[PDB]
């Protein structure tokens, strides 16, 4: 929310690397240069392919949570949503966008 | 016995307790803003207010006001009572 002025969902993606630099290593990345770790990792996992400067909070925080532990490879991304709909509580139709 | 009764939450077919505690915060979440104002004629004060130097000094005054409030003893001298009475005015004025 430091670069986010309101709560209108999607926010600018331009300064995502600078936003992540301020985060501690356990949640963010290492103290090394982001040019080797963060730059490649930002594209490494799956993201919702929205417009160029529209990326919403509940897909980035969820992505970091899923990257922290029990990381899964490509192809079985739908397995995560299956687990959420089989174990996690009511989605309230809010995970339709988070699925991709 | 209370802990054992609290261990019957068997949702761990694929995820442990930590994934049932940290991922749940993602489902129910909302980002709250900071309410940036406009008309920088007013933002000049806003920038001054929320700052490291401001809070510290303002949080040190409380410490000082508490110390002032924690010295009233029994049968205190008239000059001491007057000094404390006029010193309370200083802190009241600073806080207003």
Swiss-Prot record, chain B:
It is found in: Membrane. Residues 72-86 are extracellular. It comes from the Eukaryota. Each of the four internal repeats contains five hydrophobic transmembrane segments (S1, S2, S3, S5, S6) and one positively charged transmembrane segment (S4). S4 segments probably represent the voltage-sensor and are characterized by a series of positively charged amino acids at every third position. It is linked to Sinoatrial node dysfunction and deafness: A disease characterized by congenital severe to profound deafness without vestibular dysfunction, associated with episodic syncope due to intermittent pronounced bradycardia. Primary aldosteronism, seizures, and neurologic abnormalities: A disorder characterized by hypertension, hypokalemia, and high aldosterone levels with low plasma renin activity and an elevated aldosterone/renin ratio. Other features include generalized seizures, cerebral palsy, spasticity, intellectual disability, and developmental delay. Belongs to the calcium channel alpha-1 subunit (TC 1.A.1.11) family. CACNA1D subfamily. Voltage-dependent calcium channels are multisubunit complexes, consisting of alpha-1, alpha-2, beta and delta subunits in a 1:1:1:1 ratio. The channel activity is directed by the pore-forming and voltage-sensitive alpha-1 subunit. In many cases, this subunit is sufficient to generate voltage-sensitive calcium channel activity. The auxiliary subunits beta and alpha-2/delta linked by a disulfide bridge regulate the channel activity. Channel activity is further modulated, depending on the presence of specific delta subunit isoforms. Voltage-sensitive calcium channels (VSCC) mediate the entry of calcium ions into excitable cells and are also involved in a variety of calcium-dependent processes, including muscle contraction, hormone or neurotransmitter release, gene expression, cell motility, cell division and cell death. The isoform alpha-1D gives rise to L-type calcium currents. Long-lasting (L-type) calcium channels belong to the 'high-voltage activated' (HVA) group. They are blocked by dihydropyridines (DHP), phenylalkylamines, and by benzothiazepines. This is Voltage-dependent L-type calcium channel subunit alpha-1D. It comes from Homo sapiens (Human). The lineage of its organism: Eukaryota, Metazoa, Chordata, Craniata, Vertebrata.
């Amino acid at each position: 929310s430091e670069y986010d002025p309101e709560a209108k969902g999607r926010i600018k993606h331009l300064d995502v690397v600078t936003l992540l630099r301020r985060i501690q290593p356990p949640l963010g990345f290492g103290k090394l240069c982001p040019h080797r770790v963060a730059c490649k990792r930002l594209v490494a996992m799956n993201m919702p392919l929205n417009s160029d400067g529209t990326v919403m909070f509940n897909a980035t925080l969820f992505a970091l949570v899923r990257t922290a532990l029990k990381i899964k490879t490509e192809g079985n991304l739908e397995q995560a949503n299956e687990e959420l709909r089989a174990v996690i509580k009511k989605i309230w139709k809010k995970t339709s966008m988070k699925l991709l | 016995t209370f802990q054992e009764q609290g261990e019957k939450e068997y949702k761990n077919c694929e995820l442990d307790k930590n994934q049932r505690q940290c991922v749940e915060y993602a489902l129910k979440a909302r980002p709250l803003r900071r309410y940036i104002p406009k008309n920088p004629y007013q933002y000049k004060f806003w920038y001054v207010v929320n700052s490291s130097p401001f809070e510290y000094m303002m949080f040190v005054l409380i410490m000082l006001n508490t110390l002032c409030l924690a010295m009233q003893h029994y049968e205190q001298s008239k000059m001491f009572n007057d000094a404390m009475d006029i010193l309370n005015m200083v802190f009241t004025g600073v806080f207003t």
